[PDB]
Amino acid sequence: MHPYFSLAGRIALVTGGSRGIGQMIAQGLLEAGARVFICARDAEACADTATRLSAYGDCQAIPADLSSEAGARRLAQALGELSARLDILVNNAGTSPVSGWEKVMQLNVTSVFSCIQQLLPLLRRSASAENPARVINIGSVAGISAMGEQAYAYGPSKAALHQLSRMLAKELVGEHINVNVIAPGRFPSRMTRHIANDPQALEADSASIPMGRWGRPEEMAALAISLAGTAGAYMTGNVIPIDGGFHL
Amino acid sequence: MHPYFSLAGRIALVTGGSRGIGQMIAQGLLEAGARVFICARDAEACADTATRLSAYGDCQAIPADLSSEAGARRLAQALGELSARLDILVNNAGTSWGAALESYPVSGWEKVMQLNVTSVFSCIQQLLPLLRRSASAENPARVINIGSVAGISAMGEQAYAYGPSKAALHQLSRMLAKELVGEHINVNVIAPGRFPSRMTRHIANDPQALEADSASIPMGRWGRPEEMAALAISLAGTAGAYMTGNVIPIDGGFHL
Numbered sequence: 349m350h351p352y353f354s355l356a357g358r359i360a361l362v363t364g365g366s367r368g369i370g371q372m373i374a375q376g377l378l379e380a381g382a383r384v385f386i387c388a389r390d391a392e393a394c395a396d397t398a399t400r401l402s403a404y405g406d407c408q409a410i411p412a413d414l415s416s417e418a419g420a421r422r423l424a425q426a427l428g429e430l431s432a433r434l435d436i437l438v439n440n441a442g443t444s445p446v447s448g449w450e451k452v453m454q455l456n457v458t459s460v461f462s463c464i465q466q467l468l469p470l471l472r473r474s475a476s477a478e479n480p481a482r483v484i485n486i487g488s489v490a491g492i493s494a495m496g497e498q499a500y501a502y503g504p505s506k507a508a509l510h511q512l513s514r515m516l517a518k519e520l521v522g523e524h525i526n527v528n529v530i531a532p533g534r535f536p537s538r539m540t541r542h543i544a545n546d547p548q549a550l551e552a553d554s555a556s557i558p559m560g561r562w563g564r565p566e567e568m569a570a571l572a573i574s575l576a577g578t579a580g581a582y583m584t585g586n587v588i589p590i591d592g593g594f595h596l
Numbered sequence: 597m598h599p600y601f602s603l604a605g606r607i608a609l610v611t612g613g614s615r616g617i618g619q620m621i622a623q624g625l626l627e628a629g630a631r632v633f634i635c636a637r638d639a640e641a642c643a644d645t646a647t648r649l650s651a652y653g654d655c656q657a658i659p660a661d662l663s664s665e666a667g668a669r670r671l672a673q674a675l676g677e678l679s680a681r682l683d684i685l686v687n688n689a690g691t692s693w694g695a696a697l698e699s700y701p702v703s704g705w706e707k708v709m710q711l712n713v714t715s716v717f718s719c720i721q722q723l724l725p726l727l728r729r730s731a732s733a734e735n736p737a738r739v740i741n742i743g744s745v746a747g748i749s750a751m752g753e754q755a756y757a758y759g760p761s762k763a764a765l766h767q768l769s770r771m772l773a774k775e776l777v778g779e780h781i782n783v784n785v786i787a788p789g790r791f792p793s794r795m796t797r798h799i800a801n802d803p804q805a806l807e808a809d810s811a812s813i814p815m816g817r818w819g820r821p822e823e824m825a826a827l828a829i830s831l832a833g834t835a836g837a838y839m840t841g842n843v844i845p846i847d848g849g850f851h852l
């Protein structure tokens with residue numbers, strides 16, 4: 349790949365990389381030339397994903413349960429046996445009665461902090477003036493647009509994550525660790541598979557999106573690749589919508 | 597109190613009103629002519645506050661622990677036997693957790709998110725029936741949530757859970773503003789910088805710490821109680837009637 353977008357010789361980790369947006373990103377980074385580790389809650393499904401993604405580059409699954417402070421140290425430990433450094437961290441592991449709020453806030457915010465905190469040593473092993481280490485957090489336009497629907501825990505959790513990302517960016521910038529947010533609108537995911545399969549329900553749901561369609565997997569891949577590379581080297585603390593104009 | 601700022605005949609509830617910013621707001625609304633209830637965990641301290649605040653108008657304490665869903669439900673029930681409507685809800689109860697980045701805290705986060713975000717949602721959720729009984733075209737019911745400039749500014753203190761939790765609060769407030777607007781229920785955020793409270797008293801008593809903290813603020817000083825009171829009153833009255841979804845810093849220019 350052209351040097352603007354090439355990730356050859358870079359080592360990447362994508363949390364929640366076994367399906368949906370995380371998997372779209374992992375495939376892109378592999379296609380760009382990076383070595384890509386992935387992790388998810390389900391170790392078997394994650395290893396199956398890694399195997400399938402091995403048709404695109406060097407991909408390995410690592411066991412991780414990020415919904416705990418022990419889980420974040422375990423991932424850092426397991427990665428450290430496999431690599432001396434980490435160049436690219438993509439935090440996608442997320443989720444969507446107020447009894448469910450505690451869990452939404454845990455996975456979307458706190459677990460991302462813990463994951464970053466424990467990986468700081470090997471991120472610092474990588475970070476330099478010539479090429480900063482990259483942290484890319486997957487947020488949501490639900491954390492910015494007032495046009496929520498239901499799911500009143502989700503939007504606020506992503507806003508917490510966007511703000512956490514901004515604070516980290518500011519603190520880490522002198523250490524040559526860049527922190528940025530991709531803020532997706534609607535993209536294909538097994539959660540909304542029923543909508544995607546039925547053309548009537550698909551176009552009906554796309555009426556809320558100014559572009560009148562869902563995002564494409566290659567759009568997510570493309571953006572993640574550029575953010576991890578030359579296009580993203582001079583940015584930190586950004587929150588970038590990829591959302592069909594929803595945020596307007 | 598001039599018609600523009602008068603809250604005479606209005607019924608208010610300030611959560612976390614026993615001390616700090618809650619107390620400043622409670623006194624402010626009382627002086628504006630509002631009938632104001634206050635709630636906190638410490639039953640005795642809250643009752644002592646209400647008595648002290650009774651010098652300004654009809655103030656009454658309702659002890660409540662908002663750190664669970666059941667507590668918000670009880671508060672709604674307790675206020676319901678006391679009043680037939682609620683004109684002004686001020687959501688002030690909140691907390692910080694400060695510790696080194698690379699150390700331990702994870703239980704700190706969970707407590708911070710529950711009070712600053714989740715408990716505020718359930719609070720409004722449980723009180724919507726009283727809010728709707730108040731709400732009309734000629735005068736909307738008012739929700740006022742206390743956020744923080746920590747949720748706006750990237751400038752990191754300690755307390756890595758606090759900023760994000762307050763940002764979640766601001767977004768929640770905006771979403772609720774959009775949904776309830778057609779029912780004549782306005783929802784707005786006051787995002788303070790430094791104000792004197794129990795949480796900050798250690799800085800305030802050390803001349804050196806206070807100097808360095810004041811120097812980090814563009815206006816070079818902490819907020820005054822009367823400034824918080826004036827803004828809360830304004831927001832609850834005519835100045836806030838055509839407002840919803842706003843997040844308004846009162847921070848000495850810290851947001852810049």
Ligand SMILES: NC(=O)c1ccc[n+]([C@@H]2O[C@H](COP(=O)([O-])OP(=O)(O)OC[C@H]3O[C@@H](n4cnc5c(N)ncnc54)[C@H](OP(=O)(O)O)[C@@H]3O)[C@@H](O)[C@H]2O)c1
Pocket residue numbers: 611612613614615616617618635636637638639641660661662663688689690691692711742743744745746787788789790791792793794795796
């Ligand atoms: N001070 C600042 O500079 C600043 C800046 C930005 C934002 N804030 C926010 O503004 C709000 C004001 O707090 P403060 O620090 O100024 O005053 P504070 O002295 O800390 O008192 C806060 C109030 O919250 C109540 N409270 C705590 N936990 C509760 C619970 N589980 N259920 C019901 N009530 C509870 C307290 O009652 P008890 O006494 O019984 O515990 C008290 O009345 C907070 O939400 C804070 O995060 C403050």
